[PDB]
Short mmCIF file of C-alpha atoms in Angstrom, two decimals:
data_model
loop_
_atom_site.label_atom_id
_atom_site.label_comp_id
_atom_site.label_asym_id
_atom_site.label_seq_id
_atom_site.Cartn_x
_atom_site.Cartn_y
_atom_site.Cartn_z
CA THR R 1376 43.58 37.57 -73.44
CA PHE R 1377 45.14 39.97 -75.99
CA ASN R 1378 47.33 43.03 -76.38
CA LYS R 1379 45.35 46.41 -76.75
CA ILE R 1380 46.77 46.86 -80.24
CA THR R 1381 45.90 43.41 -81.61
CA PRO R 1382 42.58 44.54 -83.13
CA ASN R 1383 44.32 47.44 -84.83
CA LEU R 1384 47.07 45.16 -86.21
CA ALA R 1385 44.40 42.83 -87.57
CA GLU R 1386 42.74 45.68 -89.38
CA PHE R 1387 46.11 46.81 -90.73
CA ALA R 1388 46.85 43.27 -91.85
CA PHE R 1389 43.58 43.14 -93.76
CA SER R 1390 43.94 46.63 -95.20
CA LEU R 1391 47.40 45.91 -96.56
CA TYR R 1392 46.49 42.39 -97.77
CA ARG R 1393 43.38 43.55 -99.59
CA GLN R 1394 45.38 46.28 -101.28
CA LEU R 1395 47.79 43.69 -102.69
CA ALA R 1396 45.02 41.26 -103.54
CA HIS R 1397 42.96 43.94 -105.33
CA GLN R 1398 45.67 44.50 -107.94
CA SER R 1399 46.46 40.84 -108.71
CA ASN R 1400 44.80 37.42 -108.20
CA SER R 1401 47.89 35.60 -109.47
CA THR R 1402 50.55 36.71 -107.08
CA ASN R 1403 51.75 35.05 -103.82
CA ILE R 1404 51.50 37.50 -100.89
CA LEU R 1405 53.62 37.46 -97.71
CA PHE R 1406 54.23 40.17 -95.19
CA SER R 1407 54.36 40.90 -91.44
CA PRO R 1408 51.61 43.21 -90.17
CA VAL R 1409 53.52 43.33 -86.95
CA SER R 1410 56.98 44.13 -88.24
CA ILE R 1411 55.78 46.81 -90.68
CA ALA R 1412 53.47 48.43 -88.14
CA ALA R 1413 56.12 48.40 -85.44
CA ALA R 1414 58.61 49.98 -87.90
CA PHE R 1415 56.25 52.88 -88.61
CA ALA R 1416 54.90 53.31 -85.09
CA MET R 1417 58.67 53.50 -84.10
CA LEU R 1418 59.15 56.17 -86.85
CA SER R 1419 56.21 58.15 -85.60
CA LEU R 1420 58.23 58.82 -82.39
CA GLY R 1421 60.35 61.25 -84.45
CA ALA R 1422 57.39 62.78 -86.33
CA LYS R 1423 55.02 65.56 -85.41
CA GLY R 1424 51.73 66.92 -86.47
CA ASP R 1425 49.93 65.64 -89.58
CA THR R 1426 53.09 63.74 -90.53
CA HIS R 1427 52.79 61.82 -87.28
CA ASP R 1428 49.04 61.40 -87.35
CA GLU R 1429 48.89 60.02 -90.91
CA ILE R 1430 51.40 57.30 -89.95
CA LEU R 1431 49.38 56.00 -86.99
CA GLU R 1432 46.04 56.35 -88.77
CA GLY R 1433 47.54 54.55 -91.77
CA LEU R 1434 48.25 51.63 -89.33
CA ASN R 1435 44.55 51.53 -88.37
CA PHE R 1436 44.81 53.42 -85.05
CA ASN R 1437 41.97 55.92 -84.57
CA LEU R 1438 43.75 58.62 -82.60
CA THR R 1439 40.43 60.02 -81.35
CA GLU R 1440 39.96 56.76 -79.43
CA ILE R 1441 43.24 55.16 -78.62
CA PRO R 1442 45.82 57.12 -76.58
CA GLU R 1443 49.32 57.20 -78.14
CA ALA R 1444 50.98 55.80 -74.98
CA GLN R 1445 48.86 52.64 -75.34
CA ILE R 1446 50.12 52.21 -78.88
CA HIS R 1447 53.75 52.29 -77.91
CA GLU R 1448 53.23 50.25 -74.74
CA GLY R 1449 51.43 47.72 -76.95
CA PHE R 1450 54.31 47.46 -79.37
CA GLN R 1451 56.93 47.38 -76.69
CA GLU R 1452 55.29 44.34 -75.02
CA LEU R 1453 54.71 42.57 -78.34
CA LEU R 1454 58.30 43.04 -79.51
CA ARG R 1455 59.59 41.86 -76.04
CA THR R 1456 57.66 38.60 -76.51
CA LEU R 1457 59.31 38.11 -79.87
CA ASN R 1458 62.85 38.64 -78.62
CA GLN R 1459 62.54 36.82 -75.19
CA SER R 1460 62.25 31.36 -77.10
CA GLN R 1461 61.78 28.20 -79.20
CA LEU R 1462 60.10 30.22 -81.95
CA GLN R 1463 63.30 31.55 -83.46
CA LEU R 1464 61.71 34.31 -85.25
CA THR R 1465 64.15 36.74 -86.70
CA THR R 1466 62.87 40.30 -87.15
CA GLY R 1467 64.77 43.54 -87.42
CA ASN R 1468 64.32 47.14 -88.35
CA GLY R 1469 67.25 49.37 -89.34
CA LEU R 1470 67.09 53.12 -89.61
CA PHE R 1471 69.96 54.56 -91.71
CA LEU R 1472 70.42 58.32 -91.28
CA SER R 1473 72.85 60.68 -93.01
CA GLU R 1474 75.85 61.10 -90.75
CA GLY R 1475 75.78 64.86 -91.58
CA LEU R 1476 72.61 65.25 -89.45
CA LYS R 1477 72.47 66.35 -85.86
CA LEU R 1478 70.21 63.66 -84.38
CA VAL R 1479 67.86 64.15 -81.44
CA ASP R 1480 69.06 61.99 -78.54
CA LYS R 1481 65.57 61.17 -77.23
CA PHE R 1482 64.67 59.58 -80.58
CA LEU R 1483 67.76 57.30 -80.55
CA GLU R 1484 66.86 56.42 -76.96
CA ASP R 1485 63.16 55.75 -77.76
CA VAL R 1486 64.11 53.58 -80.81
CA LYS R 1487 66.27 51.48 -78.35
CA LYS R 1488 63.87 51.34 -75.29
CA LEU R 1489 60.50 50.96 -76.93
CA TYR R 1490 61.33 49.32 -80.15
CA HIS R 1491 64.49 47.27 -79.32
CA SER R 1492 65.78 48.61 -82.52
CA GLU R 1493 68.77 49.93 -84.32
CA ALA R 1494 69.69 53.40 -85.74
CA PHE R 1495 72.86 53.85 -87.80
CA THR R 1496 74.50 56.81 -89.41
CA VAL R 1497 75.88 56.41 -92.89
CA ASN R 1498 77.48 58.43 -95.60
CA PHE R 1499 74.80 58.78 -98.29
CA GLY R 1500 77.39 60.75 -100.38
CA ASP R 1501 78.70 57.38 -101.40
CA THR R 1502 75.47 55.82 -102.69
CA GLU R 1503 76.95 52.40 -103.47
CA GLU R 1504 78.69 52.03 -100.18
CA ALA R 1505 75.61 53.14 -98.30
CA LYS R 1506 73.56 50.51 -100.13
CA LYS R 1507 76.23 47.91 -99.23
CA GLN R 1508 76.23 48.81 -95.60
CA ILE R 1509 72.37 48.60 -95.53
CA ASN R 1510 72.35 45.28 -97.30
CA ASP R 1511 75.20 43.89 -95.18
CA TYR R 1512 73.17 44.78 -92.05
CA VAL R 1513 70.17 42.81 -93.31
CA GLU R 1514 72.32 39.92 -94.54
CA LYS R 1515 74.11 39.76 -91.20
CA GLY R 1516 70.86 39.94 -89.32
CA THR R 1517 69.31 37.05 -91.32
CA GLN R 1518 72.51 34.97 -91.06
CA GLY R 1519 72.58 35.13 -94.83
CA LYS R 1520 68.92 34.48 -95.73
CA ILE R 1521 68.25 37.90 -97.17
CA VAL R 1522 70.72 39.17 -99.76
CA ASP R 1523 70.85 42.32 -101.86
CA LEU R 1524 67.65 43.61 -100.30
CA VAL R 1525 68.02 47.18 -101.48
CA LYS R 1526 68.68 47.43 -105.21
CA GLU R 1527 68.87 51.24 -105.55
CA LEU R 1528 68.80 54.57 -103.63
CA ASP R 1529 67.57 57.98 -104.78
CA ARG R 1530 70.65 60.25 -105.22
CA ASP R 1531 69.08 62.58 -102.64
CA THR R 1532 68.58 59.89 -99.95
CA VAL R 1533 69.26 60.98 -96.41
CA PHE R 1534 67.08 58.50 -94.50
CA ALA R 1535 66.37 54.86 -95.28
CA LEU R 1536 64.41 52.24 -93.36
CA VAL R 1537 64.72 48.48 -93.90
CA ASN R 1538 62.44 45.96 -92.16
CA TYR R 1539 62.78 42.23 -92.38
CA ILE R 1540 61.33 39.07 -90.89
CA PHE R 1541 62.38 35.46 -91.34
CA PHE R 1542 60.65 32.46 -89.73
CA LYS R 1543 60.96 28.75 -90.05
CA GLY R 1544 58.77 27.22 -87.46
CA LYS R 1545 58.81 23.84 -85.80
CA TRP R 1546 55.44 22.14 -85.57
CA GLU R 1547 54.41 20.89 -82.13
CA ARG R 1548 53.06 17.83 -84.01
CA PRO R 1549 55.27 17.36 -87.06
CA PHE R 1550 55.01 15.64 -90.42
CA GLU R 1551 57.13 12.60 -91.25
CA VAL R 1552 59.72 13.39 -93.95
CA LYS R 1553 59.22 9.89 -95.40
CA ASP R 1554 55.63 10.81 -96.29
CA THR R 1555 56.46 13.89 -98.33
CA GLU R 1556 55.87 13.26 -102.08
CA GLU R 1557 55.38 15.29 -105.28
CA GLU R 1558 51.73 16.18 -105.83
CA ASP R 1559 49.72 18.36 -108.17
CA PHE R 1560 48.94 21.96 -107.20
CA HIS R 1561 46.04 23.48 -109.02
CA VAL R 1562 47.25 26.95 -109.96
CA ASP R 1563 43.98 27.37 -111.90
CA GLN R 1564 40.79 25.28 -112.66
CA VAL R 1565 42.50 23.56 -115.63
CA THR R 1566 46.26 23.74 -114.80
CA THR R 1567 48.51 21.97 -112.33
CA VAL R 1568 52.18 22.13 -111.37
CA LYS R 1569 54.18 19.60 -109.24
CA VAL R 1570 55.12 20.52 -105.62
CA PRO R 1571 56.51 18.64 -102.65
CA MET R 1572 53.44 17.81 -100.52
CA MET R 1573 53.69 16.79 -96.85
CA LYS R 1574 51.01 14.59 -95.47
CA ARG R 1575 49.75 13.24 -92.24
CA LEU R 1576 46.82 11.40 -90.76
CA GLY R 1577 46.18 12.91 -87.34
CA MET R 1578 43.82 14.66 -85.02
CA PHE R 1579 43.77 18.21 -86.30
CA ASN R 1580 42.11 21.41 -85.34
CA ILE R 1581 40.27 21.53 -88.62
CA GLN R 1582 36.72 22.45 -89.75
CA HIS R 1583 34.68 23.64 -92.66
CA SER R 1584 33.32 27.18 -92.46
CA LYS R 1585 30.09 27.91 -94.30
CA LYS R 1586 30.58 31.66 -93.65
CA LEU R 1587 33.93 31.66 -95.35
CA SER R 1588 33.12 28.86 -97.74
CA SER R 1589 36.53 27.37 -96.78
CA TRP R 1590 38.33 24.77 -94.77
CA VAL R 1591 40.08 26.23 -91.73
CA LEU R 1592 43.10 24.53 -90.19
CA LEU R 1593 45.04 25.58 -87.09
CA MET R 1594 48.46 24.22 -86.28
CA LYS R 1595 50.60 25.11 -83.35
CA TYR R 1596 54.28 25.80 -83.51
CA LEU R 1597 56.79 25.20 -80.77
CA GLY R 1598 57.17 28.49 -79.08
CA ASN R 1599 54.58 31.06 -78.97
CA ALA R 1600 52.77 30.87 -82.30
CA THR R 1601 49.96 29.36 -84.33
CA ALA R 1602 49.43 29.02 -88.06
CA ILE R 1603 45.91 29.35 -89.40
CA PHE R 1604 45.24 28.21 -92.97
CA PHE R 1605 42.19 28.93 -95.06
CA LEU R 1606 41.32 26.70 -98.07
CA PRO R 1607 38.57 28.22 -100.13
CA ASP R 1608 35.94 26.14 -101.85
CA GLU R 1609 35.96 26.11 -105.65
CA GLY R 1610 35.64 29.64 -106.94
CA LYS R 1611 35.58 31.15 -103.43
CA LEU R 1612 39.05 32.65 -102.95
CA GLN R 1613 37.79 36.21 -103.43
CA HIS R 1614 34.85 35.52 -101.10
CA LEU R 1615 37.23 34.18 -98.43
CA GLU R 1616 39.45 37.23 -98.76
CA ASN R 1617 36.45 39.56 -98.55
CA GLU R 1618 34.81 37.90 -95.51
CA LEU R 1619 37.76 37.53 -93.12
CA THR R 1620 37.37 39.53 -89.91
CA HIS R 1621 39.13 39.78 -86.63
CA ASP R 1622 36.08 38.41 -84.75
CA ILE R 1623 35.90 35.36 -87.09
CA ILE R 1624 39.57 34.55 -86.64
CA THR R 1625 39.40 35.02 -82.92
CA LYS R 1626 36.54 32.44 -82.73
CA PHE R 1627 38.69 29.91 -84.65
CA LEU R 1628 41.59 30.50 -82.38
CA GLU R 1629 39.32 29.86 -79.36
CA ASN R 1630 38.25 26.44 -80.63
CA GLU R 1631 40.31 23.51 -79.37
CA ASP R 1632 38.14 20.63 -80.83
CA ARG R 1633 40.17 18.16 -82.97
CA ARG R 1634 38.95 15.67 -85.51
CA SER R 1635 40.61 13.08 -87.70
CA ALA R 1636 41.82 14.19 -91.05
CA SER R 1637 44.21 13.24 -93.76
CA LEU R 1638 46.05 16.51 -94.33
CA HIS R 1639 48.17 17.38 -97.33
CA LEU R 1640 50.14 20.61 -96.90
CA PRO R 1641 52.90 21.81 -99.18
CA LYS R 1642 56.44 22.23 -98.18
CA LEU R 1643 57.00 25.99 -98.89
CA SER R 1644 59.71 28.48 -99.00
CA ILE R 1645 58.18 31.83 -99.88
CA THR R 1646 59.01 35.55 -99.70
CA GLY R 1647 57.41 38.90 -100.16
CA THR R 1648 59.32 42.08 -100.85
CA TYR R 1649 57.55 45.44 -100.85
CA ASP R 1650 58.38 49.07 -101.33
CA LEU R 1651 56.68 50.56 -98.27
CA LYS R 1652 56.61 54.10 -99.71
CA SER R 1653 54.42 52.71 -102.46
CA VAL R 1654 52.29 50.29 -100.42
CA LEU R 1655 51.81 52.51 -97.33
CA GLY R 1656 51.26 55.51 -99.60
CA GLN R 1657 48.11 53.81 -100.87
CA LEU R 1658 47.02 53.37 -97.28
CA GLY R 1659 47.37 57.12 -96.72
CA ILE R 1660 50.93 57.31 -95.30
CA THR R 1661 52.33 60.00 -97.55
CA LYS R 1662 53.69 63.08 -95.74
CA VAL R 1663 56.62 61.32 -94.06
CA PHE R 1664 58.00 60.44 -97.53
CA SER R 1665 57.39 64.00 -98.94
CA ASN R 1666 59.43 67.18 -98.71
CA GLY R 1667 56.95 68.49 -96.25
CA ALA R 1668 57.69 65.78 -93.68
CA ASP R 1669 57.80 66.89 -90.11
CA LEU R 1670 60.53 64.70 -88.63
CA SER R 1671 61.73 67.34 -86.15
CA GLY R 1672 61.74 64.59 -83.45
CA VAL R 1673 64.62 63.03 -85.43
CA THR R 1674 66.60 66.20 -86.34
CA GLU R 1675 65.59 69.81 -85.44
CA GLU R 1676 67.75 71.96 -87.75
CA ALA R 1677 67.57 70.43 -91.14
CA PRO R 1678 64.75 69.24 -93.40
CA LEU R 1679 64.28 65.49 -93.29
CA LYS R 1680 62.03 62.98 -95.11
CA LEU R 1681 62.08 59.21 -95.31
CA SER R 1682 63.62 58.55 -98.68
CA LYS R 1683 63.46 54.70 -98.86
CA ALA R 1684 61.42 52.08 -97.01
CA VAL R 1685 61.53 48.38 -97.74
CA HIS R 1686 60.02 45.22 -96.26
CA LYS R 1687 60.97 41.70 -96.87
CA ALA R 1688 59.34 38.64 -95.29
CA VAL R 1689 60.57 35.11 -95.65
CA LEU R 1690 58.66 32.04 -94.40
CA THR R 1691 59.66 28.42 -94.59
CA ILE R 1692 57.21 25.61 -93.99
CA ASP R 1693 58.45 22.07 -93.75
CA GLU R 1694 57.95 18.79 -91.83
CA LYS R 1695 59.78 19.57 -88.64
CA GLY R 1696 61.74 22.85 -88.86
CA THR R 1697 64.62 21.08 -87.06
CA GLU R 1698 66.90 18.01 -87.17
CA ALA R 1699 66.26 17.41 -83.38
CA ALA R 1700 64.11 14.43 -82.23
CA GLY R 1701 60.60 15.62 -81.25
CA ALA R 1702 58.78 14.96 -77.97
CA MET R 1703 57.01 11.59 -78.41
CA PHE R 1704 53.23 11.49 -78.23
CA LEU R 1705 50.36 9.34 -79.38
CA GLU R 1706 47.15 10.51 -80.92
CA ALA R 1707 44.02 8.35 -80.78
CA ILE R 1708 42.64 8.18 -84.32
CA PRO R 1709 39.09 6.75 -84.76
CA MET R 1710 38.17 3.85 -87.10
CA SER R 1711 36.25 6.04 -89.47
CA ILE R 1712 36.93 7.65 -92.81
CA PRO R 1713 38.82 10.88 -92.26
CA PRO R 1714 38.17 13.77 -94.59
CA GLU R 1715 41.01 14.40 -97.00
CA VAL R 1716 41.95 18.08 -96.86
CA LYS R 1717 44.48 19.07 -99.49
CA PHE R 1718 46.16 22.52 -99.61
CA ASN R 1719 46.74 21.87 -103.34
CA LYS R 1720 45.18 25.06 -104.75
CA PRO R 1721 45.41 28.69 -103.76
CA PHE R 1722 45.00 29.42 -100.02
CA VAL R 1723 45.32 32.18 -97.46
CA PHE R 1724 47.01 32.04 -94.07
CA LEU R 1725 48.01 33.96 -91.00
CA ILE R 1726 50.55 33.26 -88.34
CA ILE R 1727 49.51 34.46 -84.89
CA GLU R 1728 51.69 35.11 -81.79
CA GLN R 1729 49.91 33.24 -78.98
CA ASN R 1730 50.46 35.59 -75.97
CA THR R 1731 49.19 38.69 -77.75
CA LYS R 1732 47.18 37.16 -80.56
CA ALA R 1733 48.95 39.59 -82.94
CA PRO R 1734 49.32 38.78 -86.64
CA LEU R 1735 52.93 38.04 -87.27
CA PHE R 1736 52.40 37.13 -90.88
CA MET R 1737 49.57 37.16 -93.41
CA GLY R 1738 49.92 35.55 -96.83
CA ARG R 1739 48.48 33.82 -99.83
CA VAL R 1740 50.03 30.97 -101.84
CA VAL R 1741 48.75 30.80 -105.38
CA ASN R 1742 51.75 28.85 -106.74
CA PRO R 1743 54.34 27.43 -104.34
CA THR R 1744 56.98 27.56 -107.14
CA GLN R 1745 56.53 31.32 -107.86
#
């Protein structure tokens, strides 16, 4: 029912998330476990030795157990599913290599075949123009959604990696725009701010979890994906974050039971931008960014390290995700008081690709206006 690497990606998702959440309980979090992991597993094709092994271990692959071919086969199938589609996910990874380097052909080939990805040569002698060309690539690829991604380069940069994802999904069962109104969002136990709040009375895949002390909502998107939202009980955000597991999430995803509920969900447009050298360094991925990097799969003659690595994720949630008329359907709603479930205080979510079950996004909203 799942890709061989899905459990690893879930662990990586939680490792990275918990790292961000450990530092700050006031920040929104948004990133793609999948896009980041695929960017580094792609990179590992050009790496050898400890350089190579740290990357894959830092992505939660135990190399004593999982053969490398299974890793790359895993990613190749997952990325194929994302490029095939009503989902209209946009994800891209660009490698930007000094045009003075003699590049190994097999690497350029592998980056194409396995990772459906792009390698470019640039003149890092002109720092500003290199930055422009990198940022124009990302801008072009996001049809303008992501601008000025890279703000600066080290003067000694010879290799940069930029990884982006943008998604605005379309609910299978959408909200009515007429019902969206400004509501309070409880940023803390004594403070609110106003946000646009969508609402619907409907038959939802929704339940309360005593294990997680949270409400758990699953909503399907058109195309191959599902959003799962977790609404912690009062004072239980940290508990929620600590108790998530792959096996718990999998059991939610397996449940198809629906019950009536009055759902309030904010209309969101949120982003996360991360320096991957910093964030993956804390996960143990260090050598590839250091002078001792073994990237002889990329270039044989010359020293090479990854100078710059950036991720940016953008997610939009709204009523429909499209101007198009939806498929018409009727839900039978019982004559009984539905629970009111309001995503009007900090919550956690994941977005899951349905064929593979892989975690396309993981995030937290603590303030929709940050």
